[PDB]
Each structure stands twice: as structure tokens, then as C-alpha cells.
Design a protein around this ligand. Structure first.
Ligand SMILES: Nc1nc2c(ncn2[C@@H]2O[C@H](COP(=O)(O)OP(=O)(O)NP(=O)(O)O)[C@@H](O)[C@H]2O)c(=O)[nH]1
Ligand SMILES: [Mg+2]
Ligand SMILES: [Mg+2]
Ligand SMILES: [Mg+2]
Ligand SMILES: [Mg+2]
Ligand SMILES: [Mg+2]
Ligand SMILES: [Mg+2]
Ligand SMILES: [Mg+2]
Ligand SMILES: [Mg+2]
Ligand SMILES: [Mg+2]
Ligand SMILES: [Mg+2]
Ligand SMILES: [Mg+2]
Ligand SMILES: [Mg+2]
Ligand SMILES: [Mg+2]
Lengths: 96, 242, 389, 173
RNA sequence: AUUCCGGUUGAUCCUGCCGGAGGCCACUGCUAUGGGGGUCCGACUAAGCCAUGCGAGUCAAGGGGGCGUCCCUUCUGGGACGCCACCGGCGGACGGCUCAGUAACACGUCGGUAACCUACCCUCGGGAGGGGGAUAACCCCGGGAAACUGGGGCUAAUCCCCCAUAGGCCUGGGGUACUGGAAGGUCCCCAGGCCGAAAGGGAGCCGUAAGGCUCCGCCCGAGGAUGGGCCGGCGGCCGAUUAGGUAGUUGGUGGGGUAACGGCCCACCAAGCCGAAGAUCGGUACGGGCCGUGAGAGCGGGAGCCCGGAGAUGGACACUGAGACACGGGUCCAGGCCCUACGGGGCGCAGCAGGCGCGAAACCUCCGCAAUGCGGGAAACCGCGACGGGGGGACCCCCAGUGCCGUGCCUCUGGCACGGCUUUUCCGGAGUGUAAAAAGCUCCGGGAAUAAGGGCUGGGCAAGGCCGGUGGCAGCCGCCGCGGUAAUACCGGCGGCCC
């Protein structure tokens, strides 16, 4: 699988950066959230503990998938802004 | 409304000047009473979330507003129902960007970028004028706000004139009379968003509204209602327009 | 884990069957019904605490424990017409109590009850009521027969001895050996006769402790039930209810029953499969057919208890058919095969040219059909419900 | 009044048993290997719509009419039904065979991807054919002219290998 | 596709009606592999009757209490911290449901209010001074079968009440500053009266204290905004086997009442008002945007989505409030039904599910506040059967499957025999998806394997001059017509046609 970044936009009001990307992968299953996060973190040299993947979406007859992710500069701001379910789903915190 | 006022608003019944997807959901935001009217304003939440795109959901949009990030006419507004209307100014000082709200060529509201120097003035059309206790004069503006002047100055102000006001201090700094040769911008009707110079004024009996004729840049003449003509300068505009 | 044993009361008309249960419950039901006859079978649960309170020092005579959680009494009409109800009560219950009045001797209903008990091999103990009918008898509130006997003269004692001797002789030509509870030592071939008084509670404690004790002597291993297995029970009646539709009252005796569990019930033509919607539970110490107190809704119940099940499509349920819990299609097929080995005890014969009769339950319909057939009257249609257009 | 109800996109014959119409339609059905009559009728309706739009615009005048006229011509010659110099009159000489030639099934057969029409249908339905980098599984899809030459075997398909036994038999013809 | 075809005679040409052939809606026989999208599913008869659960709350930064945990000194206590109810504030008049009534200013459209009300919100101009009072919570004793409810003790507030000042309203006499097409309006000066405000309250830092500095708040006036009330011109059903109707009825003068104009209601004075261009009375019906059909001109319908109206078992009537004569608030009558210890006390699903009844005719007693919104809150947040997510269903529309290739044989369309290929669909796994799931989508392993019916077969009208039964019987037949022992028309087999 190969990752291509399409747009990176800054948000000073919230305090994060928003990343849109595509993954090209003929003959392979849809990439996992762990693999995408690791690759994305390495390409961007970004701390992994404050990075959330909003979604990874596949299409009908395509060889590529589209993904959307967000990066927060501070852990407290991340815990304050994002909903609980997206943090549980991405393995950042543990369920109750 | 069998017994009392309405508090809800369906998407399909929303005003026709908003940029909004009418079939995506059921409800829309019913705006609070405030400065402008329903036909010429939009709630602040849609400006934050749908237009500029600084938020994805309404919940995080309300977190931005409650921290004091948006200024309308230089004043902090926290209410997500607050209406923003024609000729208002939207400022985000943290990102350092300013906008003016204007109607489109098809009648919808858009944000037009402007400079910081021009962002401190707001033009206000004089909608009415009356006498108030102590024999003072009260001027009632097109957006609903009021101002007081002494009896000495009463002959410098008439209805349909435009006052350039400095915000947020609300101090007068210019008066633009309505007369032949004035530069106008149209805010409603079939000729909305066209601009030009005044050529003629006509009047009618028994309370029918009066009509004006306007010449544009290319030399074409078109008519409109007098109250739809907003004065913006002497022979050139004093503010930036698209 | 031991379930409450099921006791069926049998006897003849006007022999104090309902009165004994009323005195045990300390509530009045015998005066409620019209005509003095009870035509509806019911199930009542008696907690062990009131059993212990009623009993006394007598529990120390027998080397056992009172660990029985409680008792599950079943009432039964004694009228001639309600034969099927008596048969169901005799077959279903584990223990039986035959109540026979000493004065009148024997009646054909008593013989039929004994025949049914023999057919369904149900052990039982004999009771004797109407003791106060003997002249020169003092009455005292809730004292055992051992305490009461010393308060009487010789004439009453000898009359009682003669009457019980005649009764024992009667059982003898019915091929059964009988002896008094305090006058016998064997408890595998000899029954026990308890002289009781429903109106004044004489000898109730002896009968209660005997019922508690005899349960663990004949067969006790059948009283052990796994508390996690599938539910298994039987249908007691089918009746219409206001707001719930066609519901069935059942007695669960195997496994555990929870809400939304799929069940299998033998219908009239074939098995029916449905999902439980409402589980309703009677108040403790209250007759199920007499809702004096408000029923308590319950998510799940554990054997053994009498509960009302409200589920869709139960209007073709057969009284007396078993109910089996089945969570999987293979379990459903096994339950269907088990139901296929079940007989319809009573079948109505319709002549297509006859009268129309409607009742509120299936048992009343069966009794009415039998009584009409006894007089050579054809029956066009029989069903449950109100008289429609 | 009443809210919207979605309507059928094809029209049925006015009389079900007319000998000449049955003969003509049977010829078409056998040649192009369609599944049922309604499929055929679908395409017929498309043609009629085009004709009905041309008849209306020949008799109109004004500013909107000219816009719609050029829009009709552009849409027709984007689909590959008209040459790039055609005029409005040439719309009235189109036939049903012109539309049936634009189906993805017919085009896959003519390019040599398959030996037969039925084989082409299956090739499409099982997902061995790609159009402009994207897999399409509808045999009735109408192919635009601009994308006709980017029609190939899917890059993950078994047939995307010159040594596959079934591909070789297809090349043999 | 701006269309015809069968039927009156021994044969013919007409008039005229009936039938066939098309579309859409409701019910229904037989038969069914898959996915996607949508404004579909107790409207027609009963606006009939309903067990149980849920469908409207929220504020600890308005106020005194109870309980618990820690810290300081503690004989006490003072602190912080978290829970719980009560007093107090705002909301419950919106949202949801149904179509009984109504032929009317109910609705659509253009205008009017100089004849009117408006809590929440916005701008400008001002104000916050001095006193008093009870009571829930809590303690003592209770009454009654319950529903409910009594007396005594003590306490607080952004709770209640006074006094002042600002302010409002009415009438008479002057002046001419404002808007407007036009002043019973606004503004200024006298004069006689009537009514009559407010919480400097709460939180946090600097404060040694003194006191600031923000945050949220209280009252009055002028205007706007929002939501409404009222009025006018015009527009849209059927009946003459309904021809005259009206007497507060039509207008005038003087009042009352209303937020406001008005016979809206009174007292007095007149004789008007409507009508064959259809009054009055009777029938049927909620209105519109729209929907079905047709080449068009037309003809028919108005359940579902949006905007307006009306109702909460039938009929009348009030309290609180900015707004109600109030679906989950009150009173009476009529009519049903339920609980009592017999003295009394309660309830109407035309909300979501569920049940009975009626019928030809209509679903789960499910999961969630993650999205869209609303109410409350300084905020974080909390609640919502609205709304969102699934479950059952031949509701509507769109895209697919039930194999394909080569070589032979055959009755050559098709069927069979060999050899090969693919996996939409089917079975088992990993990922992604989702509030959590389920579907869907991308991969991996197995394998042509798991998948065709209904109607018709004399003419109209596409398709048999074949065989066996029955014998004016049984049966068919939209129409014309078949069947009387040699039936292309009935029943069955084998063929064939349409979808
Ligand atoms: N004197 C006396 N009367 C009694 C006694 N027990 C019961 N009775 C009376 O005799 C009658 C018995 O009726 P009941 O309770 O119906 O008997 P049962 O055992 O239920 N029979 P069923 O219901 O079929 O008639 C009642 O009237 C009751 O009051 C007793 O010990 N002594
Ligand atoms: Mg009895
Ligand atoms: Mg309608
Ligand atoms: Mg003739
Ligand atoms: Mg409906
Ligand atoms: Mg109904
Ligand atoms: Mg309401
Ligand atoms: Mg009606
Ligand atoms: Mg005062
Ligand atoms: Mg109508
Ligand atoms: Mg239902
Ligand atoms: Mg139906
Ligand atoms: Mg045949
Ligand atoms: Mg023919």
C-alpha cells in the first residue's frame, strides 16, 4: 500500500491540523488503522499519542481508499474536543 | 401556532437567501430576534460551521463561540442563534481575517474579504427620524440600532441618507446625502447587487412607494424602489464592493 | 437446589377443599364464587416461613430438615362435570391430598379420584374433615389433634374411632392398607389419615409437617433441577385477558425461563413457535385465579413457579400440552419431535348442525360440551371468546 | 394534494400482439443478446426523448431556446452518436441501432475482448473489465466517446495475463 | 402512434350502444435468488373501547438544611469535597397525532392598521434610596382502607408587602420642533386628578486591610426584531319536484365594553338590507402548493411531504400566565368503565409500541441521544418514542443473477457427450464500516456448484386441423358464440405463443 497526502490544513481556533490522504493498494485488503497510523506518523514525524484517524473508506470498484485524520498539539485539548467514542475506537483510551 | 409562538423551523421552509442543503436533515436553526430581519440575515452557527468550515459539528462550533473568538461589529457574540446581516463585519482576530456580508447576484448572502483599515467602519442607512423627550432627535437605522443628536444638527440628517459609523465606539465620521449623482448599491429585488449612480426620482399618490433610476458603468439605465437603493459614496464608493 | 413440590387437592363436592386452602392462606375465597362451587383450577405458592410459623415443636420428632423452599398447592373442582380438570390435576402434581368427609362416607367422585391417582402413580395421604359435626366436641383456634383429643370425652373418641375404622375398612376393599398417622410406623406401603377441621384449624399442623416430611422419603432425587438448563413446564389453562390478548398460565418446573426466550408449545393441529413477550407473576400467598393484589411483571423466573405468559399467536394452544424452551433451530426440531409424542386427552365431536356455545376458558368449554353430550344435543361449534356478531 | 411518486423510465407497447412488431423486436433481441423486452424498451424510450426535444426546439425562438439547442447538440456528440459537425436536423435521422451500439457489452465485443456477446456480458458481470481505471459491472452502461479507448481487462483479473488459457482462445479469433 | 378492431342482414350501406386493446390506484390467487435509493404501510368501516411501560425537563455561580469523607486546631468548631430532597427561577401554549365539524373572510392572492398586543433578543438614554413579613425543608403528635390531609415549634432568599423618587394614563388651554401621500400621533409650556418601579443580588483574582478589576445579572423610557389579532377587493362545488327571505334585521344619533375598529352589546329615531346575474333552504365536503390521465383543448382526485384551519368521549364554563378557556392542568352535566373495609375515591392513547372490536383491507410491547434541532444552564453538560438506527412487509423506482468457451452428434432454434474456464450470487475467514451492531465495500479458501414461474392456445389477438376421455350431460363464454357419439372452442397428455 502507498500513501499520498492530498491536503494539509491548519486550524488555529481549535488547535489542530487536518490531513486528507489516499491509499493505493491493488490486490490487497483495506489497510488497518494501526498500519495507517504508523505510516502516517513516520511520513510526517508527528507524535503518535495525539493523532486520531477519523475514517478509512473503500469504494466499489476502486484500488484505492480515502482517509481523514487529525493531529492535536496538546493532549488536554484533544481529550477536551474529541468525543469519547472516537478515542475508544482508535485505542487511545480504554473503555469503562 | 394554535396557542402561542413558534420555536421550531423545518429545513424545507427556511429562508431562500441561505446557503444550506434543504434535504439533508429535518430541522434548521430558528434565529433569535435581533438586528436585521429574517429575509436579510443568517444565524451565526451556519457562518462558523457551513460557510468558513472551522467546525464539523454544532457541538464543537459552540465551544469556539463560547471562548470569544468571533466579533460582529467589534463586539463579542456568543449566541449561536444571533443573526448576522447586510453590511455587517465579521472579524477573527486570532487568524487576523475580516469579512463583509453582502448579497449575491442571485440574492444569497456571501462573505467578501476586506482590509483591516476598512473593517472599522460600517455604513448605516437612515430608516426613520423622530423627536424624543428633552427635544432631542433620535435616528433609527436600517439594522434597528439608534442614535441621538441635538436639536442644532437636525437639518443635516434626512431619511435615506447614509451615515458612516466607527465601530465598536459608535461615533459618527461622515454623512452621505441621497441626491442626483450619488453612488448606490442595490440590496433587494430583481436588480439586486447591481451598482451605479442616481439619475432621477419619481413619486406617486396615496402611499405607493417611490422609484429611482440608476445608470451603471456601461451606460445602461435600470429602475428600482427607493428603499432598495443603499448610498455608498459621493461619486466613488467609500467601501470595497465586488 | 430443590424446587417446591406440587400438591393437588382432590375430593367430592362440599368436602371443604377450597376452605382448607383459604385457611392456609388466611384469606376468604370460598364466599366469592357463585353457587359455592369452584369451577376453575388454580396454583398457589406458600412460603416456608409461614409453614414454620404454623408448625411448632413437632418438627423435632423427625430427623430431617425444613430446607424445602415452599409449597405449590393446586385446587381442583369436585363436580361431576369437570372430569378433565381432575385428570390434569392428578397427572401433573407430585403429591396428592384426598379430602373425604367422614359422615357421608364415599362418593363416586372419590372413587374416580383414587382411580386417577392409581393410574398416574401419585402417592397421597388421606384427610378427614367435618370433625365438629360430632356432638360433644370443643372448638379451639389452630391447635393440633394431639392437643385437641385430650379435651374431649370418651363418647366422641369412640365415635371417631368407629368412623375411621370404617373408613380404613373401605380403603381395604379398595385394596389399600390404611392406618392413622400417629398409629403407624411403616411409611412405604401404609398411608396416613389426618383428622382435620377446616373451620377451626384442628390438625392442620400435622398434615403440613407430614407433607413436608414425606416428600424426601419416597422419591427425593426427582426434586433436583439444574438452575441453568432450558425451561420445561406444562400448560394449566388458556384464557383471554384484557389488554394482553390470548395468554396461558403455566407451571415451570425445569430449568430457568427468561424473557424473549423462544418456546415450543403443542397446538391443536401442530406445534406452535413464538417468542415470549410478557412474563407475569402472582403475588405471594394469593390465588392465581383471584387477582386480589396487582400482578408483578418479572423479567425472568426460576423453577418451580406458576407464571402467566403473554406471547403472540397462542389462541390455538392446547390445555395440558408441555412447553419446552428452544434457543436454536435444532432445539426447536427436538422440541417439535417431543411434542409429536403427546396425546389429546379430550376431543370435541361437532355435528355441524347444532347449537353455538362460547366460554371464557377451554376447561369450562370441555365441561359444558360433556354435559350437553350427556343429554343427546348436537354441537355445531365450540371456541373461546365473547359473543360476537 | 399528493406528494411525489417515482415513475417508470420506459414505455410499453400499445398493443401486445402485433405480428410485425414482434418480428422486428425478436431480430434485435437475438442480435444484441438482451435479457428481456423491458431492457430493449428502455433504450427505445431514450431515443424518443431525444427526438421529442429536437421537434420542440425547431419550432422555438428566444434566448433560452438557443442555449438548450446547443446543449442538446453537445450532449449528443459527447456520447458518440453524432459527428462533430452535425446540425439539429441530423437528430431526426437517428435509429435504435445507433443507441444499442453504445452499450458496454457491444463495445467489449467489438474491441475483441470477447469472442461472443454472451461471453462479453459475463466478462462484465463477473468484474473482469475496467473503464478509465474503474470497474463497472452494468452491461447496459452507455460509453462516452472520450473514454472508449481506455477499456481493458482489470489489472487484478485472471485474464490480465497473456498466458491464461481462456484469453488465448479469445485471441485465436 | 393526433390509430382502431368484433357485434343488428340471406347479402349491403347507416345511426347507435355494448365488448376488446393502454395507463394509474385499493383488495386478492399462484409463485419468488440479490443489492441500492425514497417524502410507503389501522386514511376508506368504528373522531369505537383500551391493561402495562415510556412520550418534558433543567439550574448547586438564587436560598437555608440533612448525610458522608478528609484537614486544622479540635472538649466546641472552622474548613474543603461529594450526594439528597425542599423553597425559588425559567420551560411545559412549541414539538407529535387525527380530519369529526365547517360552503365560512376557512383558504389562495394583492393591499391596510393614522384602529392593536408581544416574555425571550438588539441599540441608544437613564435608575438601583429606606423599612417590614411570613413560610416549606427540619423537630413533636397525628387522622384515614386508601386517595389525600390536621395542629404546635423554629428559619432563608434573586420569595412576599410598604414609603419615597423616576415613570404611566385621562381632560381642559396655548406653542408649531418631527415623520408622512395625509395627523384623533410624537415634541415644548401651564392647570385638575388617578395609578405607581427596582435584586448592587451572585461568582473569581489582586487585596494585610482599605477597595478595585473582570464575569453573570435587577427596574424605567424610545425604537426595532420575532410571533400574532383585526379589516377589505378579487378567485374556486351540486339541486327550482327548494321562490320569496330577514325584524338587532339594514342604517343613524348617544353610550358601554375590548389590546383594538365594529350591532360586538344596550337606549332612542327611521324603514331599510338580500334576491331568477339564483337569495333562502337542502346535499356533499377541511383549503392550497400539487397528483393521475390525455397530441392538445380538457376530464377526474386532493390520506402520506410543506404551508394554513380545526379537535382532544359529547355539551357548556373558569383559574394562572407575555401567550390557553390548555391532549400527558381544573369545574358541572350526559354517557361508559375501575377500586373500596361500603364511609368514599378515581380513568378516557385521534403520542410510540401492544391488545380487543369492525371489516375485503394495514408491522416490534426493539437500541441511542453519536448526528439534526428544542428547553434549561456562566460553562462543561443533562433530557427528549421529536429525530436518528435497526426488525416485519411481492409499497414505489433503479441495477443484476439463475453460467461461459471449443470440438463432435442429434429432431440442428435447441438437446446430449467430451475437454477447459469464471465466481456476480452461495458457504467459511481477515480488514474497514457503526454510538454499539447489522448491511455494504476491499482481500483470502472451496466449488457449476445454491436459484423459474404465471397466464393463454376458434375469431378479436401472437400461438395445434395432434392424441385419449365426455356426449344439449358435465362444463366454457368480457363480446361474438362452443358442446345433440367423428369437439382445432369443455377435461387431461404432448407440443407451441406472450411476458
Ligand atoms: N361445620 C363445618 N362446616 C364446614 C367445615 N369445613 C367446611 N365447612 C362448610 O361446608 C362447605 C364446604 O364447601 P367448600 O369450601 O366448597 O368445599 P370444597 O372442599 O371447596 N368443595 P367444592 O369447591 O367443589 O364444593 C362450606 O359451606 C363451608 O363453610 C367444617 O369443618 N365444619
Ligand atoms: Mg373448591
Ligand atoms: Mg390535503
Ligand atoms: Mg335492422
Ligand atoms: Mg395516516
Ligand atoms: Mg380508527
Ligand atoms: Mg399544542
Ligand atoms: Mg368529513
Ligand atoms: Mg410606589
Ligand atoms: Mg375539495
Ligand atoms: Mg401498532
Ligand atoms: Mg394492504
Ligand atoms: Mg388443452
Ligand atoms: Mg393468428
Amino acid at each position: 500500500m502507498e500513501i499520498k497526502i492530498t491536503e494539509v490544513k491548519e486550524n488555529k481556533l481549535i488547535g489542530r491540523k487536518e490531513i486528507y490522504f489516499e491509499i493505493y493498494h491493488p490486490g490487497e485488503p483495506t489497510p488497518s488503522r494501526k498500519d495507517v497510523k504508523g505510516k502516517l506518523v513516520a511520513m510526517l514525524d508527528l507524535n503518535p499519542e495525539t493523532t486520531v484517524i477519523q475514517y478509512i473508506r473503500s469504494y466499489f470498484g476502486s484500488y484505492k481508499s480515502k482517509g481523514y485524520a487529525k493531529y492535536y498539539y496538546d493532549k488536554d485539548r484533544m481529550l477536551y474536543i474529541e468525543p469519547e467514542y472516537i478515542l475508544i475506537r482508535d485505542g487511545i483510551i480504554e473503555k469503562k | 401556532a394554535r396557542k402561542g409562538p413558534k420555536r421550531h423551523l423545518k429545513r424545507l421552509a427556511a429562508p431562500t437567501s441561505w446557503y444550506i442543503e434543504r434535504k439533508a436533515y429535518k430541522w434548521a436553526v430558528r434565529p433569535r430576534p435581533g438586528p436585521h430581519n429574517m429575509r436579510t440575515s443568517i444565524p451565526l452557527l451556519y457562518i462558523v460551521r457551513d460557510y468558513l468550515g472551522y467546525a464539523k459539528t454544532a457541538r464543537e462550533a459552540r465551544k469556539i463561540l463560547n471562548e470569544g473568538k468571533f466579533l460582529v461589529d467589534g463586539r463579542v457574540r456568543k449566541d449561536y442563534k444571533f443573526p448576522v446581516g447586510i453590511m455587517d463585519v465579521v472579524s477573527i482576530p486570532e487568524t487576523g481575517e475580516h469579512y463583509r456580508v453582502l448579497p449575491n447576484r442571485i440574492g444569497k448572502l456571501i462573505l467578501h474579504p476586506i482590509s483591516e483599515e476598512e473593517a472599522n467602519i460600517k455604513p448605516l442607512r437612515i430608516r426613520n427620524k423622530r423627536m424624543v423627550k428633552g427635544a432631542k432627535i433620535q435616528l433609527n437605522f436600517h439594522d434597528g440600532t439608534n442614535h441621538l443628536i441635538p436639536l442644532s444638527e437636525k437639518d443635516n440628517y434626512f431619511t435615506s441618507y447614509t451615515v458612516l459609523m466607527k465601530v465598536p465606539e459608535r461615533e459618527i465620521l461622515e454623512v452621505l446625502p441621497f441626491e442626483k449623482g450619488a453612488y448606490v448599491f442595490v440590496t433587494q429585488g430583481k436588480n439586486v447587487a447591481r451598482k451605479g449612480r442616481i439619475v432621477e426620482i419619481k413619486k406617486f399618490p396615496m402611499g405607493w412607494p417611490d422609484v429611482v433610476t440608476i445608470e451603471d458603468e456601461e451606460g445602461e439605465l435600470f429602475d428600482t424602489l427607493k428603499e432598495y437603493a443603499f448610498v455608498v459614496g459621493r461619486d466613488k464608493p467609500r467601501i470595497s464592493l465586488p | 437446589r430443590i424446587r417446591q413440590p406440587i400438591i393437588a387437592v382432590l375430593g367430592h363436592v362440599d368436602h371443604g377443599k377450597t376452605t382448607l386452602l383459604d385457611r392456609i392462606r388466611k384469606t376468604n375465597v370460598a364466599a366469592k364464587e357463585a353457587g359455592g362451587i369452584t369451577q376453575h383450577i388454580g396454583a398457589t405458592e406458600v412460603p416456608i416461613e409461614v409453614v414454620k410459623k404454623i408448625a411448632g415443636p413437632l418438627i423435632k420428632l423427625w430427623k430431617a430438615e425444613i430446607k424445602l423452599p415452599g409449597l405449590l398447592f393446586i385446587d381442583t373442582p369436585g363436580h361431576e362435570a369437570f372430569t378433565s380438570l381432575r385428570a390434569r390435576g392428578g397427572s401433573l402434581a407430585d403429591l396428592a391430598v384426598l379430602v373425604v368427609d367422614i359422615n357421608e362416607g364415599f362418593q363416586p367422585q372419590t372413587i374416580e379420584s383414587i382411580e386417577i391417582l392409581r393410574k398416574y402413580r401419585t402417592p397421597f395421604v388421606v384427610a378427614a374433615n367435618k370433625i365438629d359435626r360430632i356432638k360433644g366436641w370443643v372448638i379451639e383456634e389452630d391447635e393440633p389433634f394431639l392437643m385437641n383429643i385430650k379435651k374431649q370425652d370418651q363418647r366422641a373418641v369412640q365415635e371417631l374411632e368407629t368412623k375411621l375404622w370404617e373408613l380404613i375398612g373401605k380403603f381395604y376393599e379398595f385394596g389399600f392398607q390404611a392406618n392413622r398417622f400417629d398409629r403407624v410406623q411403616n411409611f412405604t406401603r401404609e398411608l396416613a389419615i389426618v383428622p382435620i377441621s377446616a373451620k377451626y384449624g384442628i390438625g392442620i399442623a400435622e398434615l403440613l409437617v407430614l407433607i413436608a416430611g414425606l416428600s424426601q422419603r419416597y422419591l427425593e432425587e426427582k426434586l433436583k433441577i439444574e438452575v441453568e438448563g432450558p425451561a420445561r413446564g406444562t400448560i394449566l389453562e388458556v384464557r383471554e385477558e384484557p389488554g394482553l390478548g390470548h395468554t396461558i398460565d403455566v407451571i415451570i418446573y425445569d430449568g430457568t425461563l427468561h424473557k424473549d426466550d423462544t418456546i415450543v408449545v403443542g397446538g391443536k393441529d401442530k406445534a406452535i413457535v413464538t417468542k415470549i413477550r410478557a412474563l407475569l407473576k402472582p403475588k405471594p400467598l394469593d390465588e392465581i385465579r383471584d387477582p386480589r393484589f396487582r400482578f408483578d411483571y418479572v423479567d425472568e423466573v426460576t423453577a418451580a413457579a406458576g407464571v402467566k405468559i403473554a406471547a403472540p399467536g397462542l389462541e390455538e394452544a392446547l390445555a395440558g400440552s408441555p412447553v419446552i424452551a428452544a434457543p436454536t433451530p435444532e432445539d426447536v426440531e427436538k422440541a417439535k419431535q417431543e411434542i409429536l409424542e403427546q396425546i389429546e386427552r379430550v376431543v370435541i365431536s361437532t355435528d355441524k348442525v347444532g347449537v353455538i356455545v362460547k366460554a371464557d376458558t377451554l376447561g369450562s368449554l370441555e365441561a359444558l360440551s360433556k354435559e350437553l353430550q350427556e343429554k343427546e344435543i348436537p354441537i355445531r361449534k365450540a371456541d373461546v371468546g365473547n359473543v360476537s356478531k | 394534494g399528493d406528494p411525489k411518486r417515482q415513475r417508470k423510465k420506459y414505455e410499453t407497447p400499445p398493443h401486445p400482439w402485433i405480428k410485425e412488431r414482434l418480428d422486428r423486436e425478436r431480430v434485435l433481441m437475438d442480435k444484441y443478446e438482451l435479457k428481456n423486452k423491458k431492457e430493449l424498451w428502455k433504450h427505445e424510450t431514450q431515443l424518443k426523448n431525444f427526438r421529442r426535444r429536437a421537434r420542440r426546439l425547431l419550432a422555438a425562438r428566444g434566448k433560452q431556446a438557443e442555449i438548450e439547442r446547443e446543449q442538446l447538440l453537445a450532449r449528443l456528440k459527447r456520447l458518440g452518436l453524432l459527428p462533430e459537425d452535425a446540425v439539429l436536423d441530423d437528430v431526426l435521422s437517428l435509429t435504435i441501432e445507433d443507441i444499442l451500439e453504445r452499450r458496454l457489452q457491444t463495445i467489449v465485443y467489438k474491441k475483441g475482448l470477447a469472442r461472443t456477446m454472451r461471453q462479453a456480458r459475463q466478462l462484465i458481470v463477473h468484474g473482469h473489465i475496467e473503464v478509465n481505471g474503474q470497474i463497472i459491472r452494468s452491461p447496459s452502461y452507455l460509453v462516452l466517446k472520450e473514454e472508449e479507448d481506455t477499456i481493458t481487462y482489470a489489472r487484478t483479473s485472471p485474464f490480465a495475463n497473456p498466458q491464461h488459457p481462456e484469453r488465448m482462445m479469445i485471441e485465436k479469433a
